[PDB]
Scaffold this motif. Structure first.
Motif, mmCIF file in Angstrom:
data_model
loop_
_atom_site.group_PDB
_atom_site.id
_atom_site.type_symbol
_atom_site.label_atom_id
_atom_site.label_comp_id
_atom_site.label_asym_id
_atom_site.label_seq_id
_atom_site.Cartn_x
_atom_site.Cartn_y
_atom_site.Cartn_z
ATOM 1 N N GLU B 120 0.821 -1.201 0.000
ATOM 2 C CA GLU B 120 0.000 0.000 0.000
ATOM 3 C C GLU B 120 0.858 1.255 0.000
ATOM 4 N N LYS B 121 2.059 1.185 0.576
ATOM 5 C CA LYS B 121 2.964 2.329 0.532
ATOM 6 C C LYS B 121 3.352 2.665 -0.904
ATOM 7 N N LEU B 123 1.635 1.762 -3.527
ATOM 8 C CA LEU B 123 0.393 2.242 -4.121
ATOM 9 C C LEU B 123 0.248 3.740 -3.907
ATOM 10 N N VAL B 124 0.494 4.196 -2.682
ATOM 11 C CA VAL B 124 0.340 5.609 -2.364
ATOM 12 C C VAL B 124 1.371 6.444 -3.113
ATOM 13 N N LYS B 125 2.612 5.962 -3.191
ATOM 14 C CA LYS B 125 3.634 6.717 -3.913
ATOM 15 C C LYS B 125 3.285 6.820 -5.393
ATOM 16 N N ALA B 127 0.253 6.755 -6.544
ATOM 17 C CA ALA B 127 -0.829 7.731 -6.564
ATOM 18 C C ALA B 127 -0.273 9.143 -6.635
ATOM 19 N N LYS B 128 0.715 9.441 -5.793
ATOM 20 C CA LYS B 128 1.341 10.758 -5.825
ATOM 21 C C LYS B 128 1.909 11.049 -7.208
ATOM 22 N N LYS B 151 -7.596 -1.508 -0.187
ATOM 23 C CA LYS B 151 -6.402 -0.992 -0.845
ATOM 24 C C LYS B 151 -6.772 -0.012 -1.942
ATOM 25 N N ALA B 154 -7.985 3.262 -0.541
ATOM 26 C CA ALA B 154 -6.858 4.090 -0.127
ATOM 27 C C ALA B 154 -6.171 4.715 -1.332
ATOM 28 N N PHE B 155 -5.977 3.931 -2.391
ATOM 29 C CA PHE B 155 -5.348 4.452 -3.598
ATOM 30 C C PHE B 155 -6.169 5.586 -4.200
ATOM 31 N N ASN B 157 -8.396 7.488 -2.670
ATOM 32 C CA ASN B 157 -8.321 8.639 -1.782
ATOM 33 C C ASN B 157 -7.023 9.393 -2.004
ATOM 34 N N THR B 158 -5.918 8.662 -2.143
ATOM 35 C CA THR B 158 -4.646 9.302 -2.444
ATOM 36 C C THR B 158 -4.757 10.128 -3.716
#
Lengths: 287, 191, 29
Positions: B120-121, B123-125, B127-128, B151, B154-155, B157-158
């Motif tokens: 997920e980390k 995934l978030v990066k 997303a950024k 997951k 969260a993605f 939302n990011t």
């Protein structure tokens, strides 16, 4: 009003493509378009040239696929060169660098579209293993000719243009179209590349020539040297004696002893000396 | 609107499943057909392209406004391997980048019915990266309503940040063909 | 006589254009 010092810097790529296309198209007056750019009022940069699928008649050519050209334009914008049309070129294999009537009409159209377009002419028949027979052109305004105006102000000595050719004069040079100066600029990569093109590989650089072939080569060369020495002795037997000064070069139009002697002695120098050097160098360098 | 739409489609061995009538692969075929038709009914110049997500996350058709080639190629597909994702999304982003029509807004849509084996980390990066690269993503999930829904939430939302509504999630429970949900989905309801 | 007149005109156009195209091909030696 246009300037005399106007230059056209054509990319080496563009020149190669132009020449290859024309040499393929002999005798057909094959035609292609080029993408460049008008950097300023004194310069035009020509980047790339792409041909036209059309193959017309042995005296004329014709545009076939405006769709072809538009698609090429869009795609090259996508990738390749995001330039956009600045002129057009066509070969004239064995005519010089002049513009026919149809040439002039096509141009007139090009300028009508973009007042500062350019035409280009190449002679793959004439372009030699060395200098290359090419030129650029832009029409001459009949309005200006009748009004007495002049094509370009020559605020330079870049108006010699290397003695405009008599053939171009005849076909209409400087009375309806005027030449322009071409140039080649390299951003150092193609430059050192060009340098690389001829450069050969260390494979050969160290590859000593076989030695049996070399011995036979020397045998033949020494034999022909003996014969050349014989005829040279005969030639010197009179030489100035009996005064062929009036005979001069016309003493005989064949078989000069001295020139052949020096040529072959030089070549066998080259061969034998460099092969011996390579032998020494290898013997000692592989240990 | 001028829209360049990349679409990724899973074909994992789970897409051998048939929880959606008639079967998962045919539900994907229906979804692609409906989406392509919707895009065509949108600004015709709008362009489309296709990617399949598998062990090697291959690409089927580059950008094109056509849908006949899209559907035709998509037909010649069988479920195999497992979704690799991540790489698929990156490839799709590069695809959107190399689009002829720059004016067209950049939109990716991923059919991702499967369990997502992703960190997920990262995934978030990603997303950024994608939000900074200004591309909006819409996910269509089916099947793993629990394995990866959190997951993907969260993605999304990011991607949205605080206002990035362009990001969208649509997770469908077990049921009939994946047609009614899509047609009455926000991603196409806004259209 | 719309269709017949159009057909005759089209035949004339075809032949005339072919003749013009033909007129623009010099010979060889």
């Amino acid at each position: 009003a246009v300037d005399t010092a106007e230059q056209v810097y054509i990319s080496s790529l563009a020149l190669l493509k132009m020449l290859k296309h024309g040499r393929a198209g002999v005798p057909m007056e094959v035609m292609g378009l080029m993408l460049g750019e008008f950097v300023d009022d004194y310069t035009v940069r020509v980047i790339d040239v792409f041909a036209m699928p059309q193959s017309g008649t042995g005296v004329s050519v014709e545009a076939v696929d405006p769709v072809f050209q538009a698609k090429m334009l869009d795609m090259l914008k996508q990738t390749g060169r995001p330039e956009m049309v600045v002129g057009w070129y066509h070969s004239h294999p064995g005519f010089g660098c002049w513009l026919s009537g149809v040439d002039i009409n096509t141009q007139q159209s090009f300028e009508a579209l973009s007042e500062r377009a350019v035409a280009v002419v190449v002679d793959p028949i004439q372009s030699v293993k060395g200098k290359v027979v090419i030129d650029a052109f832009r029409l001459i305004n009949a309005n200006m000719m009748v009004l007495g105006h002049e094509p370009r102000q020559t605020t330079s000595n870049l108006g010699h243009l290397n003695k405009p050719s008599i053939q171009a004069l005849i076909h209409g040079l400087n009375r309806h179209y005027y030449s322009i100066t071409i140039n080649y600029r390299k951003n150092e990569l193609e430059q050192k590349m060009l340098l690389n093109l001829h450069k050969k590989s260390w494979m050969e650089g160290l590859t000593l020539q076989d030695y049996s072939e070399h011995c036979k080569h020397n045998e033949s060369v020494v034999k022909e040297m003996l014969e050349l020495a014989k005829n040279y002795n005969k030639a010197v037997e009179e030489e100035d004696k009996m005064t062929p000064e009036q005979l001069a070069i016309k003493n005989v139009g064949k078989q000069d002893p001295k020139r052949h002697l020096e040529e072959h002695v030089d070549v066998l120098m080259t061969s034998n000396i460099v092969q011996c050097l390579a032998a020494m160098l290898d013997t000692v360098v592989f240990k | 609107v001028l829209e360049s739409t990349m679409v990724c489609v899973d074909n994992s061995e789970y897409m051998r499943n048939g929880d959606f009538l008639p079967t998962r692969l045919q539900a994907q075929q229906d979804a692609v057909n409906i989406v392509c038709h919707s895009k065509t009914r949108s600004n015709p110049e709008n362009n489309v392209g296709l990617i399949t997500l598998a062990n090697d996350c291959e690409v089927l058709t580059t950008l094109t406004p056509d849908t006949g080639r899209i559907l035709s190629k998509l037909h010649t597909v069988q479920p195999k391997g497992k979704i690799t994702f991540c790489t698929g999304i990156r490839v799709a982003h590069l695809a959107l980048k190399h689009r002829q029509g720059k004016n067209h807004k950049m939109r990716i849509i991923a059919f991702v019915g499967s369990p997502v084996e992703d960190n997920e980390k990262d995934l978030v990066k990603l997303a950024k990266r994608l939000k900074k690269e200004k591309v909006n993503v819409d996910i269509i999930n089916f099947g793993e309503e629990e394995v990866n829904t959190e997951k993907l939430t969260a993605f999304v939302n990011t991607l949205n940040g605080k206002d990035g509504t362009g990001s969208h999630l649509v997770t469908v429970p077990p049921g009939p063909s994946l047609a009614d949900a899509l047609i009455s989905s926000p991603i196409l309801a806004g259209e | 006589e719309l269709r017949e007149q159009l057909k005759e005109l089209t035949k004339q156009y075809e032949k005339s254009e072919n003749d013009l195209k033909a007129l623009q091909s010099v010979g060889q030696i």
